[PDB]
Design a protein around this ligand. Structure first.
Ligand code: CLA
Ligand code: CLA
Ligand code: CLA
Ligand code: CLA
Ligand code: CLA
Ligand code: CLA
Ligand code: CLA
Ligand code: CLA
Ligand code: CLA
Ligand code: PQN
Ligand code: SF4
Ligand code: SF4
Lengths: 73, 738, 165, 144, 80, 73, 61, 39
């Protein structure tokens, strides 16, 4: 049970990381502004700043409070 | 012709530039606009060579800086003494040392940190110290806490005097360059005055105070009973009673019949069976010897009369056929740069502290010292760490000088020049000798572990299978044991119970015993030597590739510290002598860690224990569990981690907490040691978008750390984590099991 | 009780752990005198321990088989069962004080931004300004909601911006 | 100004020899040589390490790579207003004026150097990498 | 050889030429700036990429950049 | 215990996704290097100037995300 | 262009000062492509507080 | 003297002072109201 579970877990983690890498490469090479222009794809790059900022914030708060609670325990 | 020269009122005393941050650099003084400004401000506050270029200015600066350092030391010393006076069980420990444990640091009854107030005996509570001030003070002759009190007061006064002297000799009457250059006068003055008179007055204090009262304490008379030092001084009758020579005053010494004074100028050797310390008469004779030696030495160089030598003349007189111009110009380089002096002195200083650690654990000089194995271990490893750091700093500032203030013209065909020439042959040779030692020494251990886990211990490397014997060391030990019969016929014993001999124990506890040497110890010594050579290789490359390189031919002008030369010609990250010192520090840490591990396990396993024979704390598992890595890990580490990982609900909970914290920060360093500032700056920029959108962007622009800044913060954090972990572990474990 | 718990004032693990703490406390204390400062310290210690247990039991805290208390975080649950004194009031208090700090910080930044040396005012602080802004930071929730209703706290699209958008 | 001519017979300076010396590169694919003349006689700093003395008048030295010649050039230029020039020496000794050439160092403009590798345009005016795709080797839009 | 590219914003302040340790640059007469000089890189085969030049050029969006390419005996600047 | 480890898991997820998506999106153009798209996916650095450019590729962003992925799993 | 000391709004996408505002030092009356000279008060990633631009790239605001 | 006052109003000193104030307050609070958990 333990072997099976943890093995499939690690497999999935690696797979997702690679998926993101390849999406980035799609941006760097195959992307075009003219066709994708105006639609949801463009709007993404439009609000990328707010996206990244809110992610940073949620991660930062989780870290703070979870660790602080553990060390108080 | 030498005399005293001085200049008046060079710099006033005002807060004007105190209100002007970064005044010392015309660059920084023009104001901050980005974050890294602060880093730089802190970074180069003391870089006097980059401040200005006046030798005399930098010189006055370093003089007053010395005075500041001194004042700080006096402060901390007075603090130790006052704490010992007011918050200690010192007098209880004086009454009984063997069962009362030193404790001076006490905690406050607050949110819950009072649980640490450990019952150390003497009806006292607090925290056990390891510094050994108790045994030191007993050795000296301090009985009344009044003495500790007045001592602390005097120390504080001295600190104030030091600060005042610094202020004066910087702002009012500053000296001049030649007066800083009178080196022959300086050596004569130091070697004669300082050390000679130190050892002399030391001998005096020992004789007239610390010898009698310690004779009495060891005789066992009540502590407070023992008379007072000034009474001992006044009444010659008492000292005559103690040592019948004292009745005769000084006339016999004057008449050169020194033999009669042998009553308390002894040559016993060995130890004192009641205290485990060395014989105080022996140390007094020792210090007298040192006193006269150094005072005679302080009469060497000529200062204002033709008698005496000229350092530069002596220097030039030594030239060799294989060497060309020999030692010419060195007197110049040394009379001109601070950094050469700093390099030499740090190197010697670190080596000396190492020797201090070794000698001190070898021949314990204080009463009841050998007892606290915790104190022994602590002192040893602390002084060893300090030595390692001082030596690495020696290397650093050596390379710094070489980059900055070397001059080629003055040294045409120099020892220095020809060394710079064949640097390549030298470095290649060192490389090979290192890799050879690495191969053999470490592959031995791996071969052992493989022969074990495979199921054929028949073919391992121990005292049982194919053997390896430190024949040389055993021979030397034998000879130093048998020496006094013939070599020093007037020596009554070996100078260390480690040469061989009986066992001295006190309070059911061993104080010393002859120490065995096994194939284990052979292999450990060789690992030591390998890692040492490797560190030396790193630093020697760091200095010999300072000015230029077969890769970068203009390394010199680029300064001592810089990130790289861009990705050019294949990527030039980490090419500065500063980075050399970086990595050298890394490997120094590794080596010192290993050596103190060796020491701890050897002691715990085969010297320490209690007498019944003896009962070694691990019963001697060492000589068979220390030649395999798995054995190392499990039987030593994973074993002794017990008390430190179960120290909760007790006054040792702090040690476990710090163990955890140290693991944490040690791992935390790795983000710094691995990341890259470009990513940091990009994320910073997105954060600035976030803030600024709310109109809360800071006026100080945010900039990610400089490359070298990232490197330095990473190394500092990593080292802190590692050394803190091992420190906490050592303390908790040894205090639990001893 | 709730979700399968019981009031700490009733859990047996509570009491047996307490007996064990006190068996330890007594069988440690019996080594000293009665008048020794150590002794009086240990006595005050045991006393504070008893007081703590009393307060926790009187608070109606829940603690399962562990005996160690527990906390519940849902407004309706905590209110319907009288458990607001554990999460609700604390979170609201923190939110208030944090908004206070943030708001006075924003106001200092803005006020010092419109002066002749922003870097200087950022490296060295105007004491009168700091004090005035501190004392006026009080009504920060009202000030902020008013700014929102005027649509002033948020800036129009004039920020520095990367090339794509 | 005219192109100088490498006279192989030039008094080499006073140097005791160091490690940065001869390799087989000279007999394999390429190597370099520099020349100049000094006003007086003087000591100076060997780039590859060691102390050397320049001879009053002409001098000749040997360097493997090019940046070393560059560096000693800079040194003599800065510290004594000196003016060297050098020569790539090919496998089959095909002398090649690496220094001087333009007759005047490129620090100061000179009519005759043709503006080269220049794009009369900005850099934000380059095209997306999606469009440069599908070539026998990988091209960056920056070139077009 | 590593690739190089000037741009019309070459103010001709020569700091490119003032920096290169490989003589991969030189200044030509020009017109588009007041200095009437535009930097010129005619000798790419000796640039090693040390990027001292890109470190120099004060045009706001750089002016003249370097790009990395393949290698050779001539190119990488390796003494052996 | 299950509560606290759940929150630690959520934190790991959020921060790893943050790193990965920032790397993916800033691959086209950054305010620092507005022309990063002209270099492709992978390149070591960009010289020590401008105040240093260590590891600015989206490739290197992935290279740093892998550590957080391992931590979480 | 606008008289010296006037305040304009940078708009070149690449410009570190993009979508910001700076003070015009002066404009060349001659026909150079970027006669505009704009001081600033927030140095870029290399420590420069004044940049040059063409006419269109700016807006006097 | 005013120079000295400005030296005081420098940043690290003021940071130390404010933090000392906050910490001393918290400590005295936990003294007089030991181990609070509710309300
Ligand atoms: C279906 C699976 C799949 C496929 C077909 C590819 C295909 C490719 N990958 Mg890989 N890759 C994958 C999954 C996959 N990858 C995963 C799971 C990981 C995690 C390790 C990555 C992470 C990854 C990176 C980070 C990169 C590639 C790159 C590449 C290219 C060169 C591979 C050598 C190629 C197009 C390289 C590429 O396309 O560079 C432009 C590249 O940089 N891959
Ligand atoms: C050597 C440095 C040093 C250090 C690290 C400490 C550390 C400490 N001192 Mg201080 N102390 C020192 C020197 C030092 N002291 C000096 C030089 C004096 C003389 C003025 C004192 C006099 C002193 C007193 C009188 C007291 C402390 C106390 C303390 C504690 C809280 C403050 C703390 C353990 C307090 C303490 O430990 O209370 C139990 C306390 O009451 N110290
Ligand atoms: C030859 C080197 C030497 C040796 C082996 C020792 C040995 C010792 N010295 Mg030191 N000591 C020396 C030179 C030496 N000292 C010199 C040159 C001076 C004068 C500056 C002193 C001044 C000195 C003092 C003031 C004290 C020691 C003490 C000690 C002990 C500390 C270890 C030990 C007995 C301590 C001691 O004897 O404690 C009982 C002590 O208090 N020494
Ligand atoms: C270096 C410090 C020092 C100092 C300050 C003194 C001070 C003194 N010694 Mg001397 N003394 C010293 C070292 C010192 N001694 C040493 C190292 C020796 C061995 C050579 C002696 C041996 C010695 C003897 C044997 C006697 C003195 C005595 C005295 C007192 C009269 C002179 C005087 C208090 C006389 C005295 O009063 O003894 C109680 C005395 O008879 N001293
Ligand atoms: C004797 C003590 C001592 C002294 C007076 C100095 C003095 C100095 N060090 Mg430090 N330094 C020392 C020991 C010392 N160092 C040690 C033991 C190490 C090893 C960790 C170093 C390693 C070191 C480095 C690596 C650097 C300094 C630097 C400096 C200078 C600025 C701070 C200054 C001259 C900095 C400097 O500006 O050097 C030129 C610098 O970069 N030091
Ligand atoms: C680098 C040091 C070193 C040295 C000096 C030796 C020494 C020896 N090895 Mg080797 N060995 C080493 C490392 C080393 N080994 C490592 C790292 C793995 C092994 C694995 C290994 C095996 C598997 C065997 C040896 C054997 C031996 C013996 C004869 C060869 C001899 C005791 C042979 C032997 O005689 O085994 C009894 C043998 O069979 N070694
Ligand atoms: C959004 C997440 C969330 C979750 C998962 C819960 C969970 C719960 N809430 Mg709700 N609640 C929340 C947030 C949430 N609440 C907040 C922020 C408030 C403040 C207004 C409330 C106010 C509230 C009240 C006043 C009550 C509950 C109740 C409950 C419980 C039963 C209802 C249920 O299954 O809700 C599942 C999750 C939701 C419905 C999400 C929407 C939450 C909104 C904000 C409130 C909904 C209240 C709900 C209709 C009450 C039903 C009775 C349960 C513990 C009831 C209770 O205690 O039952 C024992 C109850 O009386 N909650
Ligand atoms: C007056 C003080 C102040 C205020 C009101 C803000 C405002 C903001 N900061 Mg904080 N912040 C400040 C100073 C301040 N910051 C300072 C001095 C630092 C230390 C360098 C930071 C570093 C910082 C970071 C790195 C982040 C915030 C975030 C935020 C946002 C929400 C609040 C938060 O969680 O923090 C918002 C942009 C977070 C955010 O963007 O949330 C969306 C975020 O990621 N801040
Ligand atoms: C960041 C998380 C966090 C939180 C939310 C709390 C919450 C609390 N702590 Mg603190 N505490 C924490 C971390 C935290 N602590 C840490 C990291 C430490 C070590 C520096 C402590 C050490 C500590 C102690 C020693 C005490 C508290 C106490 C308290 C109470 C203060 C009111 C409350 C229960 C006090 C209390 O009464 O708790 C019930 C108490 O005794 N805390
Ligand atoms: C994490 C990290 C950073 C980011 C970390 C930074 C910029 C340091 C942040 C320092 C503190 C946390 C912020 C400034 C603190 C000051 C005291 C300002 C006042 C703050 C108040 C809260 C008191 C780098 O810049 C970096 C650079 C080079 C190699 C590795 C790394 C690296 O690993
Ligand atoms: S920033 Fe780092 S990787 Fe880039 S050139 Fe400098 S040292 Fe090398
Ligand atoms: S690109 Fe820059 S450094 Fe080179 S000539 Fe033009 S302005 Fe000068």
């Amino acid at each position: 049970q333990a072997a099976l579970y943890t093995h499939h877990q690690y497999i999935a983690g690696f797979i997702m990381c690679g998926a993101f890498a390849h999406g980035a490469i799609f941006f760097i090479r195959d992307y075009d502004p003219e066709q994708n222009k105006g639609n949801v794809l463009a709007r993404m790059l439009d609000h990328k700043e707010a996206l990244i900022s809110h992610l940073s914030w949620v991660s930062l708060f989780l870290g703070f409070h979870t660790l602080g609670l553990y060390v108080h325990n | 012709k030498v005399k005293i020269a001085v200049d008046r009122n060079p710099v006033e005393t005002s807060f004007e530039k105190w209100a002007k941050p970064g005044h010392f650099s015309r660059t920084l003084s023009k104001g901050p606009n980005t974050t890294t400004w602060i880093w730089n401000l802190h970074a180069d506050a003391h870089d006097f060579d980059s401040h200005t270029s006046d030798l005399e200015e930098i010189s006055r600066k370093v003089f007053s800086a010395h005075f500041g350092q001194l004042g700080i030391i006096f402060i901390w010393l007075s603090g130790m003494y006052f704490h010992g006076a007011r918050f200690s069980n010192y007098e209880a420990w004086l009454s009984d040392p063997t069962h009362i444990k030193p404790s001076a640091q006490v905690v406050w009854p607050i949110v819950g940190q009072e649980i640490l107030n450990g019952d150390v005996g003497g009806g006292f509570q607090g925290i056990q110290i390891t510094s050994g001030f108790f045994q030191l003070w007993r050795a000296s002759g301090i009985t009344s806490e009044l003495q500790l009190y007045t001592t602390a007061i005097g120390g504080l006064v001295m600190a104030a005097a030091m600060f005042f002297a610094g202020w004066f000799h910087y702002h009012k009457a500053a000296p001049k360059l030649e007066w800083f250059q009178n080196v022959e006068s300086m050596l004569n003055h130091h070697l004669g005055g300082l050390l000679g008179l130190g050892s002399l007055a030391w001998a005096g204090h020992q004789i007239h105070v610390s010898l009698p009262v310690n004779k009495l304490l060891d005789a066992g008379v009540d502590p407070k009973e023992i008379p007072l030092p000034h009474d001992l001084l006044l009444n010659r009758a008492i000292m005559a009673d103690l040592y019948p020579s004292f009745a005769k005053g000084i006339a016999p010494f004057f008449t050169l019949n020194w033999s009669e004074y042998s009553d308390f100028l002894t040559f016993k050797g060995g130890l004192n069976p009641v205290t485990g310390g060395l014989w105080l008469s022996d140390t007094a004779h020792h210090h007298v010897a040192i006193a006269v030696l150094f005072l005679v030495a302080g009469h060497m160089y000529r200062t204002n009369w033709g008698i005496g030598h000229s350092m530069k003349e002596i220097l030039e007189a030594h030239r060799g056929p294989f060497t060309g111009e020999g030692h010419v110009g060195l007197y110049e380089i040394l009379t001109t740069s601070w950094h050469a002096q700093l390099a030499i002195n740090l190197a010697l200083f670190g080596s000396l502290s190492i020797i201090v650690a070794h000698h001190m654990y070898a021949m314990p000089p204080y009463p009841y010292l050998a007892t606290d194995y915790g104190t022994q271990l602590s002192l040893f490893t602390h002084h060893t760490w300090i030595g390692g750091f001082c030596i690495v700093g020696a290397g650093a500032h050596a390379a710094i000088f070489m980059v900055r203030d070397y001059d080629p013209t003055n040294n045409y065909n120099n020892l220095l020049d020809r060394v710079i020439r064949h640097r390549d042959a030298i470095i290649s040779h060192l490389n090979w000798v290192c890799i050879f030692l690495g191969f053999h020494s470490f592959g031995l251990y791996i071969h052992n572990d493989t022969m074990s886990a495979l199921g054929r211990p028949q073919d391992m490397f121990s005292d049982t299978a194919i053997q390896l014997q430190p024949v040389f060391a055993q021979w030397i030990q034998n000879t130093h044991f048998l020496a006094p019969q013939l070599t020093a016929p007037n020596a009554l014993a070996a100078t260390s119970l480690t040469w061989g001999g009986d066992l001295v124990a006190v309070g059911g506890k061993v104080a010393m015993m002859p120490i065995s040497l096994g194939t284990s110890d052979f292999m450990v010594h060789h690992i030591h030597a390998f890692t040492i050579h490797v560190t030396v290789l790193i630093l020697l490359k760091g200095v010999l590739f300072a000015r230029s390189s077969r890769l970068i031919p203009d390394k010199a002008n680029l300064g001592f510290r810089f990130p790289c030369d861009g990705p050019g010609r294949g990527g030039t990250c980490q090419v500065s002598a500063w980075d050399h010192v970086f990595l050298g520090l890394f490997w120094m840490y590794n080596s010192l860690s290993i050596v103190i591990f060796h020491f701890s396990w050897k002691m715990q396993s085969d010297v320490w224990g209690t007498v019944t024979g003896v009962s070694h704390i691990t019963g001697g598992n060492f000589a068979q569990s220390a030649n395999t890595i798995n054995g190392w890990l499990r039987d030593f580490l994973w074993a002794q981690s017990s008390q430190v990982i179960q120290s909760y609900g007790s006054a040792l909970s702090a040690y476990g907490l710090i163990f955890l914290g140290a693991h944490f920060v040690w791992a935390f360093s790795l983000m710094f040691l691995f990341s890259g500032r470009g990513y940091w700056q990009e994320l910073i920029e997105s954060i600035v978008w976030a803030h600024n959108k709310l109109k809360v962007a800071p006026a100080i622009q945010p900039r990610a750390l400089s490359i070298t800044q990232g490197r330095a913060v990473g190394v500092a954090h990593y080292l802190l984590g590692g050394i803190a972990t091992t420190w906490s572990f050592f303390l908790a474990r040894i205090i639990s099991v001893g | 009780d709730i979700a399968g718990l019981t009031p700490c004032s009733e859990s047996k693990a509570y009491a047996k752990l307490e007996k064990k703490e006190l068996k330890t406390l007594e069988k440690r204390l019996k080594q000293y005198e009665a008048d020794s400062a150590p002794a009086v310290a240990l006595k005050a210690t045991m006393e504070r321990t008893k007081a703590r247990f009393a307060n926790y039991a009187k608070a109606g805290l829940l603690c399962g088989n562990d005996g160690l208390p527990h906390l519940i975080a849902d407004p309706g649950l905590a209110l319907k069962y009288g458990h607001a004194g554990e999460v609700f009031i604390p979170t609201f208090g923190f939110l208030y004080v944090a908004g206070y700090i943030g708001y006075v910080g924003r106001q200092y930044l803005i006020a010092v931004k419109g002066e002749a040396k922003p870097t200087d005012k950022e490296i060295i602080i105007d004491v009168p300004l700091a004090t005035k802004l501190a004392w006026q930071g009080a009504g920060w929730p009202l000030a902020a909601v008013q700014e929102l209703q005027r649509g002033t706290l948020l800036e129009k699209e004039e920020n520095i911006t990367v090339s794509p958008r | 100004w005219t192109v100088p001519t490498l006279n192989p017979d030039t008094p080499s300076p006073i140097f005791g020899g160091s490690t940065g010396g001869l390799l087989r590169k000279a007999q394999t694919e390429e190597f370099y040589v520099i020349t100049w003349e000094a006003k007086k006689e003087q000591i100076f700093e060997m780039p590859t390490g060691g102390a050397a003395i320049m001879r009053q008048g002409p001098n000749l030295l040997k360097f493997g790579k090019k940046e070393q010649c560059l560096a000693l050039t800079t040194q003599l230029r800065n510290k004594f207003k000196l003016t060297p020039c050098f020569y790539r020496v090919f496998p089959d000794g095909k002398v090649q004026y690496l220094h001087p050439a333009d007759g005047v160092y490129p620090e100061k403009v000179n009519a005759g150097r043709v503006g080269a590798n220049q794009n009369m345009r900005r850099i934000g005016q380059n095209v997306n990498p999606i469009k440069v795709k599908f070539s026998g080797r990988m091209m960056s839009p920056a070139e077009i | 050889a590593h690739i190089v590219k000037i741009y019309d914003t070459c103010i001709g302040c020569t700091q490119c030429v003032r920096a290169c340790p490989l003589d991969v640059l030189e200044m030509v007469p020009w017109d588009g700036c007041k200095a009437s000089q535009m930097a010129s890189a005619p000798r790419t085969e000796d640039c090693v990429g040390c990027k001292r030049c890109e470190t120099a050029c004060p045009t706001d969006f750089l002016s003249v950049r370097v790009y990395l390419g393949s290698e050779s005996t001539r190119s990488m600047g390796l003494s052996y | 215990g299950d509560f606290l480890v759940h929150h630690a898991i959520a934190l790991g997820l959020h921060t790893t996704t943050l790193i990965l998506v920032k790397g993916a999106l800033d691959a086209r153009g950054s305010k620092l290097m507005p022309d990063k798209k002209d270099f492709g996916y992978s390149f070591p650095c960009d010289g020590p100037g401008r105040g240093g450019t260590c590891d600015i590729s989206a490739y290197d962003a992935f290279y740093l995300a892998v550590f957080w992925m391992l931590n979480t799993i | 262009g606008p008289k010296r000391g006037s305040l304009v709004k940078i708009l070149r996408p690449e410009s570190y000062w993009f979508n910001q505002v700076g003070k015009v030092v002066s404009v060349d009356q001659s026909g150079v492509r970027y006669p505009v000279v704009v001081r600033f008060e927030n140095q870029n990633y290399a420590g420069v507080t004044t940049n040059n631009y063409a006419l269109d790239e700016v807006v006097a605001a | 003297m005013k120079d000295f006052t400005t030296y005081l109003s420098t940043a690290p000193v003021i940071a130390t002072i404010w933090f000392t104030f906050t910490a001393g307050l918290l400590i005295e609070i936990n003294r007089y109201f030991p181990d609070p958990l509710v309300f």
